Amino acid sequence: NVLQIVRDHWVHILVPVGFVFGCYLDRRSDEKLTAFRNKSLLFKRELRPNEEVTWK
Amino acid sequence: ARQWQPDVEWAEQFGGAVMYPTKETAHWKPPPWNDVDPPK
Amino acid sequence: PPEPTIRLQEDPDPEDENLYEKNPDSHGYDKDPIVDLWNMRVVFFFGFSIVLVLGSTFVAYLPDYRMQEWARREAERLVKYREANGLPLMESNCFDPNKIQLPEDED
Amino acid sequence: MLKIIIPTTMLLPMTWMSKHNMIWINATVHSLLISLISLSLLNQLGENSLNFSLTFFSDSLSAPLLVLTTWLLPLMLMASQSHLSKETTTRKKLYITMLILLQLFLIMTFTATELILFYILFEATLVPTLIIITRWGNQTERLNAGLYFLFYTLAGSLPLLVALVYIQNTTGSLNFLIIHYWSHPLSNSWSNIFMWLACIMAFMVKMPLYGLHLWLPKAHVEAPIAGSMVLAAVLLKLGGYGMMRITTILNPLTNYMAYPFLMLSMWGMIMTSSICLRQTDLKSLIAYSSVSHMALVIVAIMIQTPWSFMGATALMIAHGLTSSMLFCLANTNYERVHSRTMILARGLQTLLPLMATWWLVASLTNLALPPSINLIGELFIITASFSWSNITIILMGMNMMITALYSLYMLITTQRGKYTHHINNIKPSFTRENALMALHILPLLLLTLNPKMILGPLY
Amino acid sequence: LQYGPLAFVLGERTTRKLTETSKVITVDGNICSGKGRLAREIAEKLGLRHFPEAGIHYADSTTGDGKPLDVQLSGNCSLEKFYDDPKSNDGNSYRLQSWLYASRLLQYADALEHLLSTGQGVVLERSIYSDFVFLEAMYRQGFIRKQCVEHYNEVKKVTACEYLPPHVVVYVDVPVPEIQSRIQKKGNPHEMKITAAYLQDIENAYKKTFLPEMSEKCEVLQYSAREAEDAEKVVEDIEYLKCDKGPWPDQDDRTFHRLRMLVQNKLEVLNYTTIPVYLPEITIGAHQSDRVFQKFTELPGRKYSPGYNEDVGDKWIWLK
Amino acid sequence: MNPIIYTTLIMTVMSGTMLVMISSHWLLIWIGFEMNLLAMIPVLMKNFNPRATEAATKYFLTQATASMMLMMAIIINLLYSGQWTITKMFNPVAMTMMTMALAMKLGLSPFHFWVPEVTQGISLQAGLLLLTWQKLAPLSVLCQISQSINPNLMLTMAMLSILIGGWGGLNQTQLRKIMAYSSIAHMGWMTAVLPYNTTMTILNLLIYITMTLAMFMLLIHSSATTTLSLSHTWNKMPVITSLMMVTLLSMGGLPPLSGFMPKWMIIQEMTKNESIIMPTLMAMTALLNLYFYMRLAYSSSLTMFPSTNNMKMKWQFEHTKQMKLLPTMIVLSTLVLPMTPALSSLN
Amino acid sequence: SSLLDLIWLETILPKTTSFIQMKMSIMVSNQKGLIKLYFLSFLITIMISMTLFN
Amino acid sequence: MPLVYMNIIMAFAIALAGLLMYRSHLMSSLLCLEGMMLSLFIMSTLIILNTHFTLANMMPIILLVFAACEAALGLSLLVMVSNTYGTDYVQNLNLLQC
Numbered sequence A: 001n002v003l004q005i006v007r008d009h010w011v012h013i014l015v016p017v018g019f020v021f022g023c024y025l026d027r028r029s030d031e032k033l034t035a036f037r038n039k040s041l042l043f044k045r046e047l048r049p050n051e052e053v054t055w056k
Numbered sequence B: 001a002r003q004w005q006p007d008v009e010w011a012e013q014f015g016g017a018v019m020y021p022t023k024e025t026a027h028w029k030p031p032p033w034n035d036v037d038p039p040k
Numbered sequence C: 001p002p003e004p005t006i007r008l009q010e011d012p013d014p015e016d017e018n019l020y021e022k023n024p025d026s027h028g029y030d031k032d033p034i035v036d037l038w039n040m041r042v043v044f045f046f047g048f049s050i051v052l053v054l055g056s057t058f059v060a061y062l063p064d065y066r067m068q069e070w071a072r073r074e075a076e077r078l079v080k081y082r083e084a085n086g087l088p089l090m091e092s093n094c095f096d097p098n099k100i101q102l103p104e105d106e107d
Numbered sequence D: 001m002l003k004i005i006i007p008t009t010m011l012l013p014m015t016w017m018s019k020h021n022m023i024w025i026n027a028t029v030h031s032l033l034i035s036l037i038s039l040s041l042l043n044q045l046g047e048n049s050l051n052f053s054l055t056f057f058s059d060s061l062s063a064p065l066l067v068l069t070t071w072l073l074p075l076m077l078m079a080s081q082s083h084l085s086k087e088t089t090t091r092k093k094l095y096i097t098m099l100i101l102l103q104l105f106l107i108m109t110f111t112a113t114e115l116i117l118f119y120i121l122f123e124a125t126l127v128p129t130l131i132i133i134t135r136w137g138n139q140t141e142r143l144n145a146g147l148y149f150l151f152y153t154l155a156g157s158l159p160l161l162v163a164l165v166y167i168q169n170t171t172g173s174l175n176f177l178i179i180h181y182w183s184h185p186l187s188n189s190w191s192n193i194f195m196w197l198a199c200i201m202a203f204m205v206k207m208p209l210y211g212l213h214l215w216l217p218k219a220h221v222e223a224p225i226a227g228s229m230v231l232a233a234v235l236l237k238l239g240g241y242g243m244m245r246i247t248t249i250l251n252p253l254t255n256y257m258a259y260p261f262l263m264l265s266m267w268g269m270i271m272t273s274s275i276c277l278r279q280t281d282l283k284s285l286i287a288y289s290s291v292s293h294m295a296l297v298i299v300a301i302m303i304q305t306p307w308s309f310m311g312a313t314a315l316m317i318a319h320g321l322t323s324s325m326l327f328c329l330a331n332t333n334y335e336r337v338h339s340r341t342m343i344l345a346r347g348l349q350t351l352l353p354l355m356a357t358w359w360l361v362a363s364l365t366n367l368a369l370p371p372s373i374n375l376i377g378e379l380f381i382i383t384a385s386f387s388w389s390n391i392t393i394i395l396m397g398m399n400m401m402i403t404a405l406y407s408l409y410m411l412i413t414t415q416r417g418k419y420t421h422h423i424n425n426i427k428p429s430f431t432r433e434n435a436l437m438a439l440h441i442l443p444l445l446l447l448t449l450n451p452k453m454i455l456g457p458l459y
Numbered sequence E: 001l002q003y004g005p006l007a008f009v010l011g012e013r014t015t016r017k018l019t020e021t022s023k024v025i026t027v028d029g030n031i032c033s034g035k036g037r038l039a040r041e042i043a044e045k046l047g048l049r050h051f052p053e054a055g056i057h058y059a060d061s062t063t064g065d066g067k068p069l070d071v072q073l074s075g076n077c078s079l080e081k082f083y084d085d086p087k088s089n090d091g092n093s094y095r096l097q098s099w100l101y102a103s104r105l106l107q108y109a110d111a112l113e114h115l116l117s118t119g120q121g122v123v124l125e126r127s128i129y130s131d132f133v134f135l136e137a138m139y140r141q142g143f144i145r146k147q148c149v150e151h152y153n154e155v156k157k158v159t160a161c162e163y164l165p166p167h168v169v170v171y172v173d174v175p176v177p178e179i180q181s182r183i184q185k186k187g188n189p190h191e192m193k194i195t196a197a198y199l200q201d202i203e204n205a206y207k208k209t210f211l212p213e214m215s216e217k218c219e220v221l222q223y224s225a226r227e228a229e230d231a232e233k234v235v236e237d238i239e240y241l242k243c244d245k246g247p248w249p250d251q252d253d254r255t256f257h258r259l260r261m262l263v264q265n266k267l268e269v270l271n272y273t274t275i276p277v278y279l280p281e282i283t284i285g286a287h288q289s290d291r292v293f294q295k296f297t298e299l300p301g302r303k304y305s306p307g308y309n310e311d312v313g314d315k316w317i318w319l320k
Numbered sequence F: 001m002n003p004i005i006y007t008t009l010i011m012t013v014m015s016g017t018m019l020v021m022i023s024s025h026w027l028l029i030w031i032g033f034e035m036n037l038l039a040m041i042p043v044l045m046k047n048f049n050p051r052a053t054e055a056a057t058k059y060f061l062t063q064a065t066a067s068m069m070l071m072m073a074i075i076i077n078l079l080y081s082g083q084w085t086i087t088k089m090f091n092p093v094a095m096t097m098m099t100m101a102l103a104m105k106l107g108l109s110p111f112h113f114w115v116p117e118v119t120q121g122i123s124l125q126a127g128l129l130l131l132t133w134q135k136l137a138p139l140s141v142l143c144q145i146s147q148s149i150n151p152n153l154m155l156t157m158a159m160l161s162i163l164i165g166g167w168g169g170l171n172q173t174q175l176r177k178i179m180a181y182s183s184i185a186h187m188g189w190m191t192a193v194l195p196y197n198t199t200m201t202i203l204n205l206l207i208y209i210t211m212t213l214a215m216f217m218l219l220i221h222s223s224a225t226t227t228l229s230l231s232h233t234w235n236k237m238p239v240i241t242s243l244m245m246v247t248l249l250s251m252g253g254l255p256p257l258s259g260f261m262p263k264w265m266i267i268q269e270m271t272k273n274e275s276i277i278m279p280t281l282m283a284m285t286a287l288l289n290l291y292f293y294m295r296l297a298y299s300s301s302l303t304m305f306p307s308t309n310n311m312k313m314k315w316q317f318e319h320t321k322q323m324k325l326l327p328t329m330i331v332l333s334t335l336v337l338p339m340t341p342a343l344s345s346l347n
Numbered sequence G: 001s002s003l004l005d006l007i008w009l010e011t012i013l014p015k016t017t018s019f020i021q022m023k024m025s026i027m028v029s030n031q032k033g034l035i036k037l038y039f040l041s042f043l044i045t046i047m048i049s050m051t052l053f054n
Numbered sequence H: 001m002p003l004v005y006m007n008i009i010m011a012f013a014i015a016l017a018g019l020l021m022y023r024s025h026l027m028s029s030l031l032c033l034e035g036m037m038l039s040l041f042i043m044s045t046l047i048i049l050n051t052h053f054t055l056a057n058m059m060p061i062i063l064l065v066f067a068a069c070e071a072a073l074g075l076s077l078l079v080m081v082s083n084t085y086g087t088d089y090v091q092n093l094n095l096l097q098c
């Protein structure tokens, strides 16, 4: 029954929501370490005509 | 079949005035339950 | 000695409850048959079916990030080049001597 | 990494708002789901590491231990489901909370790019374990066992804090990458000797080394089942992981500072293997077996050769899984028998055949049978020690023979022979115990197909 | 605004409410006497408030619903079993005696709180004082051991060193054969098993010890069975006597404030009734205590605070 | 006593401490100490009894001797340099005598003997005030002249204090004496970092005050004085026992609880000054504090001691008076490690 | 098993520590509560600090 | 540093030793405290008057006042002790112990 199983099975959504939040936080934290993107002496590459960043 | 829990004999160890009783402190008495001494 | 010889008031030690006596097909999970059966189902499905098989296949087919085939190809090219030109294969000095500077002793 | 840490944290509100009769199901399902997420970390590269951020990084040494840690929790829940039947809802939720906190602390410990954070979580892993041992323990000696486990660890690990802050004051950073790249030799001086001792003793006490192992039989015997498996499987590997991480700055002093510990371990392996032969208890026997295996791991780490490190990692994982299985089987026997004595119940193979099969498989794996990863790690360490000195083979072979002897003695005394007459409560084994044994053993026989996943960074 | 130091600071002075009519009175008598009838008449005539004698389930009447709880959850003792088997092996006699003494202490605290809060006096049956006579009767008859009376004396002295003795003590005297005949007439199946020696011990423990101790510091009105029927003379005697020997005249506003803070907050009142001395009659094992407490928590209005019970019917929970 | 008089005496104690902390004259500091001592005595004697009187007279004798020593030190300092401002002492003998005076006021060993007895005689409320509030004036005075104190004397007194607190805490059974020895050991820890960094001293003082306030409020909530009276608590309010065990684990220095923040940080500071032996010794000594805290936790919460029948009646009544700031104190004393860098606020 | 693990290894590290700490606790905590001895010790330590640390 | 100051500090030290000796008669302890206070007053007065530190002439009087107050307080406590024991021997205060 809708709106009845929710009051008993709302706890199951907690862990996957936490996983998605963790993935988002990991990407956001990775966004702060772009001080050498496409500046590495080994992977220094000329950008593609329709490319703005080497990686996200 | 039952988890062991302390009995009276185990509890009496902490009932003294001090731990590790010795000869000198064998005659010490625990303070009264309320901090009031007889007027004598 | 009119002492009761009872040190304290205590419940008698209860006897172990057999899970099969009141419920055959007991699965050893819970005394409530429906919750018990569903616990068995989810344990078997997420343990064997989902993790132990899909995860095993995922680990089996992991991309070669350790660069084993890349190292094999590089070694093949190096060996071919050094054999064709008569170079002595592996070199004793890891780093070329000219770049390195050794402090003079004069002792 | 936060994709792993965050769900483990969310396990707590998930458990605390669950219904009174559905906590075990939810905890088991979501713990298994978390383990699947942790599988992604295993794909390491031959280069440096998976540097996730400034606080967490993953290597090919941390990946197998992390996967094992995440995998152990569902097994702990299934093991604890038995003896917590008559427990109130609040106390069961507190037990699951302690297990979840232990897993979270271990997960944060194993990456811990900075050494002070590693130490903080390495000591934080001590509170939930002590609470579990001293609260949900059957015997009256659980209190003394908890005190021993706390103080043996803390006395060793307290000088480590001083050593670490001193290193930070002189070196200037405790980040493991900077520590590895800027490492400099340690001169032969009394101050450097004591720095070596401070940095090493904290991990050698937890492994444990022979002569400081007195806390382990007590902690393993008096603890509940889940505490026993988490002690034997993961908590023993903290010392070895820390030692292999920290030996990068102790060279070349170790070249001669390893002699006392090498001799102690190479003799204590024989001593504890012999002790296992004359034992009246099952859990004590398994604990002493764990001591022997960890002594071998200590020898391997102190040798400091690539084959030593590979064998050490393989033996770590294999011994964790095997000891967890053996403790599970002993607990299943004890639940029916209620005595915990080896010779009180005999001939159980006639009454419980499948559990006899599980006993045989666990004993064979403990016996270091090829091509299981137990023997892979064993043999790698044997070859490395042989390269170290040709005379070690005598001690190692003696240990192997005694290990086989006591493993088959454990199997024969409890499984073969005529059944005891005055025991008539040996009920048929539940599906839960069989599933627990299967989930313990199948990963071992699966990892024997892909050894490179557990051979460490020096593969 | 519940009573506290702030209320005393602003307006609450309890010496104004006392109007010479308070006169806390305890009516004490032998088993199956006419004191209960007499106490009711005194309270009716003098305008005071009558407190019925504290029983096993007295405390259950003041907390939550007045309906008594199960015997296992409140008292763990029964009077009928004491009458049937006075020398019961499981130490029922002491457990009954202690539970009754603590119930009487709670009743005395409640009576003092009512007197200090309102100013209207109270009438009581056997108080914490005179309760020791039953203990003496049990001990001399051999029902309880010496350590038993030692523990009772310790608890009694600790608990009673902080309360004001009653203004007037009224005693109804009935000879032993007469009360034996009254017991036979009563018809309660357990009560004819009361031995004459037990009643004699109760009476001479009353007369030899309790009465002189009350006389030396209070007013004593010894009444026979006949002369206690006429409540008019009793009330006239109550009015005629003047209280000038007890501690009550020496009390002031500050001491009354301290006493009023003590009588409320019943936890401190009952704090010393559970001193950690382990007699086999009163001590309870860990498993039994855990099981009984868990069963107590499952009661309808006992899981949470009084105002925070959903099953009882308390609403607006999430805003209180 | 009258509530107004009690409030006035408490205000006078706080005013004396404030006068000590906010004044720049030695005479005014001595006046503040005298006012504090004068108003603090009736607080010990609120519940009149022979034990309270004896504790109060011991406290008065010790404090008066300390004040006289402090005044003599001030006089000598004035003699050898005509300065009244609280600054460099300008004299070794005056500094030594003032250090002993402030040690007597604080309770550092070997001037520690009065603390256990005074704490035992007086009530829980009086003890709570004495244990935390009293420390603020002498510690402020010591922080103001830390550049002149002799490191040898302060360090040896701190080491002796830690040793004595750890050893004496093992034997005691009453909770008040355990708290007194715990305070002695914590002050031995805290005064050892005075010559190096006073900010660490202030941080340790704040953490210790929070922990001991929480523990004393928990002890007042469950009216227990001896160990067995505390063991009986689990049958009525198990939550109190659980919170008390968590706070006890925090007070032992176990990470990641808040009580680990000071010690760790303090060690760090003494490692910056090439002092290695002493921090190790103080850590291995604090292991003893941990031991007797663990014994108390075993007695209180981790095991269920036998109960009493009359306790049933206590199940029906609720705690009428609730003390505010107890949950805040527990949280601040248990879960504030991740905010360690906030110590840069020069708290 | 018995002689090394259960007897001497126990005697060296844990049991010796327990015995020493118990003896020290008994020695330190055994004070009769007399302030005469307390203040005599105070005088002794005042003299010691006056003549030693200067 | 002339001999007068040396003699005053010697008197203070002697009074402190007498206070810390504790034979009996807590009244003697209070007397020793007040002897220490008197020595402090004399020394401070001499130091302040010698250097013509005019505004500091307040210091002795203030000192005396406060110290005398403490003496009064002490006496009160002593009285109560006697009222509980009948005499003021120091050895009677042994209920509290470490």
Ligand SMILES: CCCCCCCCCCCCCCCCC[C@@H](O)O[C@H](CO[C@H](O)CCCCCCCCCCCCCCC)COP(=O)(O)OCC[N+](C)(C)C
Binding pocket: C051, C052, C055, C056, C057, C059, C060, C061, D064, D065, D067, D068, D071, D317, D443, D446, D447, D449, D450, D454
């Ligand atoms: C009951 C009676 C028997 C019935 C069964 C009959 C069938 C017999 C089959 C049983 C064994 C026969 C051997 C057949 C082996 C073939 C498969 C093998 O070759 O694949 C392995 C692959 O297997 C996996 O690598 C091993 C499993 C991964 C281990 C993870 C465990 C699962 C997670 C659970 C938690 C783990 C806890 C411990 C953490 C460390 C080796 O991989 P590799 O040869 O290179 O190449 C793979 C393909 N490539 C080329 C594209 C790369």
Ligand SMILES: CCCCCCCCCCCCCCCCC[C@@H](O)O[C@H](CO[C@H](O)CCCCCCCCCCCCCCC)COP(=O)(O)OCC[N+](C)(C)C
Binding pocket: A023, C050, C054, C055, C057, C058, D003, D036, D037, D038, D039, D040, D041
């Ligand atoms: C025929 C096929 C045979 C092989 C089948 C293999 C199937 C493998 C399934 C198991 C996968 C194991 C879990 C892997 C988790 C690690 C990777 C994970 O963290 O990645 C996240 C992504 O995860 C996926 O989105 C979700 C996968 C979760 C589910 C896996 C499939 C099985 C789930 C089963 C759940 C229960 C099923 C229903 C039961 C009732 C975040 O990725 P992100 O860091 O952004 O990537 C950045 C790089 N980009 C930009 C290129 C992407």
Ligand SMILES: CCCCCCCCCCCCCCCCC[C@@H](O)O[C@H](CO[C@H](O)CCCCCCCCCCCCCCC)COP(=O)(O)OCC[N+](C)(C)C
Binding pocket: D188, D189, D190, D193, D210, D211, D212, D260, D261
């Ligand atoms: C009990 C269970 C196990 C616990 C842990 C056991 C491991 C701890 C053992 C410590 C390892 C070795 C310590 C010192 C090693 C240095 C080598 C030294 O011992 O040999 C000679 C040193 O001579 C003497 O040994 C001097 C030290 C003697 C005093 C030390 C105590 C010896 C016995 C105490 C045993 C107690 C161990 C357990 C304590 C609880 C060489 O003389 P020299 O070449 O000139 O000096 C070398 C050092 N230099 C180069 C820096 C100058």
Ligand SMILES: CCCCCCCCCCCCCCCCC[C@@H](O)O[C@H](CO[C@H](O)CCCCCCCCCCCCCCC)COP(=O)(O)OCC[N+](C)(C)C
Binding pocket: F203, F206, F207, F210, F332, F333, F336, F339, F340, F341, F342, F343, F345, F346, F347
């Ligand atoms: C548990 C940790 C302790 C918590 C303590 C209680 C928290 C609540 C206190 C409420 C605010 C405190 C002060 C109120 C603000 C106004 C007062 C302000 O003007 O004072 C300033 C100073 O502000 C305070 O010092 C900072 C108070 C902040 C205390 C928290 C630091 C704790 C660090 C570790 C725990 C992290 C926080 C955990 C949650 C609170 C002036 O500084 P200044 O007069 O020029 O220097 C004097 C100090 N000297 C003499 C040494 C130089």
Ligand SMILES: CCCCCCCC/C=C\CCCCCCCC(=O)O[C@H](COC(=O)CCCCCCC/C=C/CCCCCCCC)COP(=O)(O)OCCN
Binding pocket: D152, D155, D156, D159, D162, D163, D166, D191, D192, D194, D195, D196, D197, D198, D201, D205, D212, F274, F275, F276, F277, F280
């Ligand atoms: C299960 C119980 C195990 C107990 C383990 C305890 C022993 C651990 C080893 C010693 C711990 C203390 C070492 C100090 C921490 C390291 C800090 C450091 O390295 O700094 C040194 C300082 O070295 C020291 O100060 C060491 C002093 C040691 C004092 C404490 C002694 C403890 C016991 C010593 C013997 C124990 C050794 C064997 C223990 C075996 C286990 C029982 C450098 O000094 P600098 O000031 O920089 O000088 C440079 C200018 N020349």
Ligand SMILES: Nc1ncnc2c1ncn2[C@@H]1O[C@H](COP(=O)(O)OP(=O)(O)O)[C@@H](O)[C@H]1O
Binding pocket: E030, E031, E032, E033, E034, E035, E036, E053, E079, E096, E097, E100, E101, E131, E134, E135
């Ligand atoms: N401390 C006690 N021990 C045993 N019984 C008690 C105790 N206190 C009260 N009682 C019981 O309370 C009952 C009522 O007392 P009583 O006044 O004699 O009868 P009634 O209420 O009809 O006048 C009596 O049967 C008496 O036994």
